[PDB]
Structure formats: structure tokens, C-alpha cells
Amino acid sequence: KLIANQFNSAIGKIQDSLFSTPSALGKLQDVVNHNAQALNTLVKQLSSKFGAISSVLNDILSRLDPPEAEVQIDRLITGRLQSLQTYVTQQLIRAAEIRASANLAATKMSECVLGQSKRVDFCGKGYHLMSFPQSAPHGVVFLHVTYVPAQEKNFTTAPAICHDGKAHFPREGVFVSNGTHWFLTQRNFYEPQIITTDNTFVSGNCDVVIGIVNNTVYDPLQLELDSFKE
Amino acid sequence: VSMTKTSVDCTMYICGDSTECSNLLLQYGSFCTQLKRALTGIAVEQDKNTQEVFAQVKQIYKTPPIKYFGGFNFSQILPDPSKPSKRSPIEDLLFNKVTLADAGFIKQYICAQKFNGLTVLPPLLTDEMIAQYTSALLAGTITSGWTFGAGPALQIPFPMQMAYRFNGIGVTQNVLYENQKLIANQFNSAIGKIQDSLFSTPSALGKLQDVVNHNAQALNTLVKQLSSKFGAISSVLNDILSRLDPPEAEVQIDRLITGRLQSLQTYVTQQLIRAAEIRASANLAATKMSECVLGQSKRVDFCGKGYHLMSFPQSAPHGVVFLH
Amino acid sequence: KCVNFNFNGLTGTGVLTKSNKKFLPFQQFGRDIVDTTDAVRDPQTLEILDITPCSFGGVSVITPGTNTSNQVAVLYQGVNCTEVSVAIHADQLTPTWRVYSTGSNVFQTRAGCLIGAEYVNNSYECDIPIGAGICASYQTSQSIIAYTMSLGAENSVAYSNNSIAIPTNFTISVTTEILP
Ligand SMILES: *[C@@H]1O[C@H](CO)[C@@H](O[C@@H]2O[C@H](CO)[C@@H](O[C@@H]3O[C@H](CO)[C@@H](O)[C@H](O)[C@@H]3O)[C@H](O)[C@H]2NC(C)=O)[C@H](O)[C@H]1NC(C)=O
Ligand SMILES: *[C@@H]1O[C@H](CO)[C@@H](O[C@@H]2O[C@H](CO)[C@@H](O[C@@H]3O[C@H](CO)[C@@H](O)[C@H](O)[C@@H]3O)[C@H](O)[C@H]2NC(C)=O)[C@H](O)[C@H]1NC(C)=O
Ligand SMILES: *[C@@H]1O[C@H](CO)[C@@H](O[C@@H]2O[C@H](CO)[C@@H](O[C@@H]3O[C@H](CO)[C@@H](O)[C@H](O)[C@@H]3O)[C@H](O)[C@H]2NC(C)=O)[C@H](O)[C@H]1NC(C)=O
Ligand SMILES: *[C@@H]1O[C@H](CO)[C@@H](O[C@@H]2O[C@H](CO)[C@@H](O[C@@H]3O[C@H](CO)[C@@H](O)[C@H](O)[C@@H]3O)[C@H](O)[C@H]2NC(C)=O)[C@H](O)[C@H]1NC(C)=O
Ligand SMILES: *[C@@H]1O[C@H](CO)[C@@H](O[C@@H]2O[C@H](CO)[C@@H](O)[C@H](O)[C@H]2NC(C)=O)[C@H](O)[C@H]1NC(C)=O
Ligand SMILES: *[C@@H]1O[C@H](CO)[C@@H](O)[C@H](O)[C@H]1NC(C)=O
Ligand SMILES: *[C@@H]1O[C@H](CO)[C@@H](O)[C@H](O)[C@H]1NC(C)=O
Ligand SMILES: *[C@@H]1O[C@H](CO)[C@@H](O)[C@H](O)[C@H]1NC(C)=O
Ligand SMILES: *[C@@H]1O[C@H](CO)[C@@H](O)[C@H](O)[C@H]1NC(C)=O
């Protein structure tokens, strides 16, 4: 119930964050603005003279004899052709940038939406749980749902527990102490458990391991047998 | 990670201290404005790239005053407090090895340093700030493993961090604990070997020297182009105005304007292409920083040959060096 | 001084200084690696003079935004504030507009000379970037200030040989990534 409530709260906050902030979608608005600016610049270049007496071809043809009119027109042709060639080159560079972004978006969709990525900070901040796509003009928006640890407490730890001269290591977890008793807990969420022969494995004697501490590992089978046989 | 930032004033380059040439240049429209926007966009992109690669940590982490990490010696990785700028020995070596640029920043001040209207801009982050980000990343990794990357930093003894990294690759914890001294000795030896390899190999940093050399070549070529006539009687505008009456000066000046404008468009085009290549490299560096410094990557050969355990970033001029 | 010179038939604008170049009796003029004239022999007295171009650079305007305040700061990129101050007193700068340039509002940055902003020692997160670690912002009577930007808050880790921090709770977070 807590997780469902936190998820719903986070989604509502996302909607409010996008609505409230005018710059939230700047990445896509910049693409739109650059394409509009490129076309407006390309059109405005037609007004320039490029050294000609006039930017209007009909004025050149009406004012000069064919020879000079052809020279002035060729000059305007050079100017307009250079402007278009520049436009196309800039569009090729922008298209390459967009291609790289689109390839990243497709990778993000495959790794984050169609699976649970292990990659750090690839699918948002925190430990990745899941993601959801949303469409947008000229692009895609990903909502990355992650697990973020909170409210940590520090405990005393040890690499191993020594019982009858044997070194016990966690199978899946870390040994922690609250100051009086040693427990095994999972690393990403405090949940103390009794240290038993099912939770740990044994390798070697209690000498080589640096920082090994003395404690009792509770074997369940022996405890039952001492009741069974009496 | 980043490229030298430049800003070129179109009018001074093409028509320096020439009113008549500037008036003629005005007849070509927005071209000067488009080049100014292109170079500004490149400069902003280079600062974005540096921030994305290095400014990945919200807080500045510090190591404890007692630098005992289970026998693992990080003295060659962590900041050396006795030197100005607080760089680590390896970062200091990298700085001494590849800083062959003509300063690379304004510094409140080619023999002429391309003062033909070409201005090099300083990075937004100083070398000290980049070193500080690297130090924060190192302190976080050393003292908290990957918990630092995902959320708040959680302290863990270093040999237990190694034990969990061993479980990550697929080796049990007892292998590390039984061989902890051997592992620490091999780590310290490898770090010493890296310092010796970088010191003794001039070509080790070739990627960054090549980036610097390409930007120096582009600026040298752009300045060199001013000496060409492009069909004009003289490459110097003052000689054209002092020698010819306006009606002929306009022709000779127009020829020079065409040549210089073509030179600037060629320069800007190559800088845009190089900017795209550098942005791709910076994106890869940021990805590696997230995947391998803030976590333990499982991608084969992504961060070194062998089974990945961890990585440590080091700052370098215009780039990042990872020790995997 | 920055002057317009004409030595025989070579004209230009620049600063003439006493040279330290070992000209032979043969050479009359000097050029650098990019074929720009940088030294001349004075037709009279045969003094060798070096030519330094007159200082120039870009101009940046730092604006809090006109919906907040109309005060702006001006960065003179590429030059030492001593030369800008001298040019102001001599009325030599190409732009004809001026900034108040009162005491304490002229600050030397690596990027250039910043006029119209008060530098403070307290560090803040970067707002309007200037360069080389220096950013500007509009803060309190509000005025434009300059500062060395903060990178983040400090957080020492309580590292020890046998201390581990274990989360006891968690947050489910949703973040937004926007890609073209
Ligand atoms: C460290 O953790 C252990 C176990 O979680 C703590 O010991 C436990 O403390 C609780 C305190 O409420 C004990 O509960 C009490 O047990 C007695 C009978 O033993 C009962 O009469 C009381 O009404 C209450 O239920 C619990 O038994 C005890 N368990 C053991 C094995 O000692 C310990 O106090 C913790 N220490 C610190 C410093 O946090
Ligand atoms: C961590 O590693 C560094 C080196 O990577 C250790 O510092 C090094 O300590 C040795 C100790 O002998 C220094 O040796 C010196 O050699 C010169 C002759 O070459 C001699 O004149 C000196 O009296 C000294 O014997 C070595 O220079 C020094 N290196 C550096 C860069 O400081 C450091 O002690 C190691 N930390 C631990 C805790 O072991
Ligand atoms: C696994 O490989 C490591 C090396 O990668 C072995 O450790 C190495 O063991 C040799 C001895 O077999 C050591 O050589 C000795 O070094 C001492 C140094 O004082 C020297 O006095 C001796 O004469 C001899 O040269 C070597 O230093 C040591 N290397 C390290 C880094 O500790 C290890 O024994 C191998 N284990 C197995 C089970 O094969
Ligand atoms: C772990 O953290 C979560 C929060 O992220 C804790 O749940 C939160 O507990 C507080 C009470 O300590 C709740 O505040 C209360 O909300 C009710 C709503 O009607 C209000 O009437 C109360 O006056 C008070 O404000 C909070 O709502 C609740 N959050 C959620 C999402 O349920 C949780 O208890 C923590 N668990 C541990 C073991 O620390
Ligand atoms: C764990 O218990 C063992 C005993 O089972 C301790 O070993 C003894 O250590 C003392 C010194 O501390 C020696 O004088 C004894 O001779 C040792 N006896 C044996 C049988 O080894 C061991 O020191 C304990 N460890 C800790 C950390 O308390
Ligand atoms: C960690 O250790 C003890 C509590 O066990 C305390 O002195 C210290 O302040 C704790 N620090 C943090 C950050 O929990
Ligand atoms: C800037 O001018 C001051 C004026 O005294 C001088 O001391 C300083 O060295 C100059 N810096 C540079 C880089 O020219
Ligand atoms: C003549 O030439 C010499 C050397 O060039 C110079 O010192 C002297 O002043 C000149 N006399 C004039 C210009 O009357
Ligand atoms: C960790 O153990 C070493 C053993 O030499 C000791 O010097 C160091 O002080 C210990 N760390 C702490 C925080 O006590």
C-alpha cells in the first residue's frame, strides 16, 4: 500500500512539474525553434544583394543590357546558392545530432521499458524498477520509476562470524549489529534475521580473515535433534 | 570531454578597421550572425559536455583523515594536499604531460596568438573545480561503493565493498578475505605501474594532444588565410583603399570579402563536425562515469579487459582518464 | 600608444614600442609566423620598433532579465582592466556607451574585465555563467553580484573499519527524461 501510494504521488508530482515549469520541454522546443530559424534565415537571404545593385531580378533585367544583367544575376545566383548550400550542410549536421538522439531514445526504450536495466543512471536516478514512454512533438518523454534508499542507520559489521573455529560468511547479505546482537540483513533494506547455518556458508578456519568476530551461528537441525532424542 | 572554445568576430576578421569593407560586407546578410550563433552554440555545448561528465555528484565528498582502507593505498589517486590546485599525483602528471596548448584560456591576456579577431574563451569550470569533482567522486566510491551513485552515500568498509564486487563478478567473499593482503598488494603494484607507464610513455595521452593539435591547426589555418589575395591586387585592405579609387576598391575588396567569408564558413563547418565528435565522446565518457565509477558494470570490455571490479576517474586537460 | 602609423608605404593601426629583435643592417621590416608585419625600421634614426595590435575583444552583457531589472553588467573579454580603465579615461573604446564604473564594481576575471557587478566572497550556485569559475546573479535593494560558484554542499562520510549504513526505508521516485 505504501509503494502504490508513493507511485501515485510521484506521478501526480510529475504532471505538476511539467505543467508548472515553462522550460521543462526546452529540449524539443529548441529543435522546433532551430528549424523555424533556419527557414526564416534562408528566406531572408533572398533580400540580400550580395554585391548586386538590387536583390530583385526584374530590376537587374530592366536596368542593364544583357551582359551586365547576366553578371549581376550570376552574382545573385552565387549568393543564393551559397546560402542554400550552407542551409543543407547545417541540416545535415543537425540531422546527425538528431539521429544520435533518436538512437539513444530507442536504446532507452528497449532497455528501460521492455526490461529492467542494471545500468547506473541510464534509466533515471536510483535503482531502476521500470519506465513508461509518453509521446511528444518531435520526440519522446520517459518516466523512469526507481527505488531510492532512505532513512539509513549505521550498524557495526564484520566480514565473518566465528562459531566452532570455522569462519561463516553471508550467502546473500551483510552481518550487522545493533550493539548487543549480531544479525544477517539484506544490503538494500534493513531486515534483521537470525544468523543460522542456512543463511551463511563456511570456508576455512578463524585465523586468516581480518576482523572476524566471535558469535553463535544457530544450526536448526542440531537444536531439533537435541529435542527429538532428549 | 571538451574542446577549446572560440569566438570569431566576422567583421574584424573579414574587414578589419575598414569602414568601406564593412559596408560591403553588410550586403551578404545574416552570414556573420549565423557563424556567431554556430560558435556560441559550440562553446555552450563544450561547457555542457564538461558539466555532464564531471558534475554528476550532488555533494562534495571527502575521505576520512585516517586513510586506512584495508591495505589499499589510494595516495596516488586522492588529492595531494601539499601542492597548489590539490591534484593527485596522477592528475598532476597528466597536467604536466598534455598542456602543450597556447594556454587554452584568456589568462587576462603563434607569436601574435591569433589576435586577428579570433578569441579563445575560458572554460566555465577551472582545473581546480574539475579536480574537486573528481575528488568527490573518488571519496564517494572509496567510502560507500555504489550506494553513493544511486542515492545517499552509505559508508561500508572497503574490503567488504570489494567482497561484494567479487560477488558481482561471480567470485565468493571468502576468496577476497582469504587473499585480502595479496589483492591489496596487487592493486598497489598496478597503480604504481600505471604511474610509471604514463610518465615513461609520451604517446599515452595522444587522444587529448590530437584534439589540442587539431584546434591549433584550425586556428593557424584560419589566420594564415588572411595573407592570401584570392585574385586581388593585394591582401591588405589598407593598400587597396590607399591605392585605388572607391569604384575599383569595391571590386578588390569584394574579392577579399569572398575569400575571407569562405574561410570562416569552412572553419565553422569543421568546428561543427568536431563539436559533434567531441559531444559523442563526452556522452561516452559520461556513460562510463555512471556505469563504472558510480557502479559495477557487467558489460564486457566496457571498462577494461577482464571482469569489472571498479574504476577511478582522473581529470586531464580537455578530458577524463579512467583507471579500470 | 595606440596610433595610426604610416612608415613609407606601410600603413596601419597599432602600438609602437622599442624592440628587442636582432635586426641586421640588411633587414628593414619583420614578420611573424603568419606573415603579419610586427616590426619596422624607423626611416629616421633607424630605430627598430615592434608593432603590437591595439587591444580588442568581445563584449558580453549580463542581464537579470527586463521583467526583473534593467541593470546590466558588461564583460570586456580578453583584456586587463587597467587598459579598459585607461581607454575609458581617454574615450578610446569603440562603443560609445559607458558603465558607471564606480569603485568596487570593476573586477578582474580570467575571462576579462567585468564592470557593473559587485564581487562577494560568499559562494552561491551558478546562475548566469561568466567563466573560469565566476558566475553572476541578481541578489540583495537588489543588484548584480559576481561570485566564484559553489560546486555542491560538503558531506563527509563516516567511514570506519567496521561501520556500515543500511537503509531502513525507501522512496519510490519518478523522474522525467526528454529526448528528441
Ligand atoms: C538488539 O536486538 C535484539 C533482538 O531484536 C534485542 O533483544 C530483544 O529486545 C526485546 C525488547 O523488547 C525483547 O523483548 C522482550 O522479551 C522479554 C522476554 O525475553 C519479554 O518479557 C518482554 O515483554 C519483551 O517481549 C527480546 O526478548 C530481546 N531478544 C533477545 C534475543 O535478547 C536487543 O535489545 C537489541 N539491542 C539494542 C541495543 O538495540
Ligand atoms: C602509499 O604509496 C606511496 C607511494 O606510492 C607511499 O609513499 C612512498 O613511501 C616510500 C617509503 O620509503 C618513499 O620511499 C622514499 O624513497 C626515497 C628514495 O627514492 C628515500 O630517499 C625516502 O627516504 C623514502 O625512502 C616513497 O618516495 C613514497 N612515495 C611518495 C609518492 O610519497 C606511501 O607511504 C604508501 N602508504 C602506505 C600507508 O603504505
Ligand atoms: C597467486 O599468484 C600470486 C602472484 O600473482 C602469488 O603471490 C606471489 O608469490 C610469490 C612466491 O611464490 C612471491 O615471490 C616471493 O616474494 C618475496 C617478496 O619478499 C621474495 O622474498 C621471495 O623470494 C619470492 O620472490 C610473490 O611476491 C607473490 N606476489 C604477491 C603480489 O604477493 C601467490 O602465491 C599465488 N597463489 C597461488 C595459490 O598460486
Ligand atoms: C517510511 O517512509 C514513509 C514515507 O515515505 C512512511 O509513511 C508515511 O508515514 C507518515 C507518518 O509518520 C504519514 O504521515 C501521516 O499521513 C496521514 C495521512 O492521512 C496524516 O493524517 C498524518 O497526520 C500524517 O501526516 C505519511 O502519509 C506516510 N506516507 C505514505 C506514503 O504512506 C513510513 O511509515 C516509513 N516507514 C518506516 C518503517 O519508517
Ligand atoms: C574467540 O574465541 C576463541 C576461543 O574459542 C578465542 O581464542 C582464545 O584467545 C585468547 C586470547 O584472546 C587465548 O588466550 C586463548 O588461548 C584462545 N583459545 C583458543 C581455543 O583459541 C578468540 O580469541 C576469541 N576471539 C575474539 C575476537 O574474542
Ligand atoms: C554513525 O555511528 C554512530 C552511531 O552508531 C554515531 O556516532 C555517528 O554519528 C553515526 N553517523 C551517521 C551518519 O549515522
Ligand atoms: C594586469 O594589470 C595589472 C596592473 O598592475 C598588472 O599588475 C598585471 O600583471 C596585469 N596582468 C596581465 C596578465 O597583464
Ligand atoms: C637625418 O637623418 C638622421 C638619421 O636618420 C636623423 O637622426 C636626423 O634627425 C635627420 N635630420 C632631419 C630629418 O632633419
Ligand atoms: C583500522 O585499522 C587500522 C589498523 O592498523 C587502524 O590503524 C585504524 O585506526 C583503524 N580505523 C579506525 C577508524 O579506527
Residue numbers in the entry:
A (entry chain C): 921 to 1150
B (entry chain A): 729 to 837, 850 to 1064
C (entry chain C): 537 to 676, 689 to 728
Paper text:
The JN.1-sublineage KP.3.1.1 recently emerged as the globally prevalent SARS-CoV-2 variant, demonstrating increased infectivity and antibody escape. We investigate how mutations and a deletion in the KP.3.1.1 spike protein (S) affect hACE2 binding and antibody escape. To investigate the effects of N30 glycosylation introduced by S31Δ and two RBD mutations (F456L and Q493E) on the structure and function of the spike protein, we determined the cryo-EM structures of the recent SARS-CoV-2 variants KP.3.1.1 and JN.1.11 along with engineered variants JN.1.11 + S31Δ+Q493E, JN.1.11.1 + S31Δ, and JN.1.11 + S31Δ. The spike proteins exhibited three conformational states: “one RBD up,” “all RBD down,” and “flexible” (i.e., one or two RBDs disordered in the density maps due to flexibility).
JN.1.11 is JN.1 plus V1104L, and JN.1.11.1 is JN.1.11 plus F456L. Prior studies also indicated that the JN.1 spike protein exhibited either a “one RBD up” or “all RBD down” conformation. JN.1.11 showed an NTD structure similar to JN.1. Structural alignment of SARS-CoV-2 WT, JN.1, and JN.1.11 spike proteins with KP.3.1.1 showed that the NTD and RBD exhibited greater rootmean-square deviations (RMSDs) than S2. V1104L has little effect on any conformational changes; V1104 and L1104 are both surrounded by a conserved hydrophobic pocket formed by P1090, F1095, I1115, and T1120 in the same protomer. Using 3D variability analysis, we quantified the particle proportion for each conformational state and found that S31Δ did not affect the proportions of “one RBD up” and “all RBD down” particles by comparing the proportion of JN.1.11 and other spike proteins that have S31Δ. Besides, while F456L alone did not affect hACE2 binding (JN.1.11.1 has F456L compared to JN.1.11), Q493E alone substantially reduced binding affinity, which is also consistent with prior research and is likely due to the electrostatic repulsion between hACE2-E35 and RBD-E49317. Additionally, S31Δ did not markedly affect the thermostability of the spike protein compared to JN1.11, JN1.11.1, and engineered variants, as assessed by nano differential scanning fluorimetry, but retained a substantially increased melting temperature (Tm) over the SARS-CoV-2 wild type (WT) (Wuhan-Hu-1; GenBank: QHD43416.1) (Tm of 46° C vs. 32° C). In addition, other spike mutants with Q493E retain BD55-1205 binding, while F456L resulted in a binding affinity decrease where the only mutation of JN.1.11.1 is F456L compared to JN.1.11.
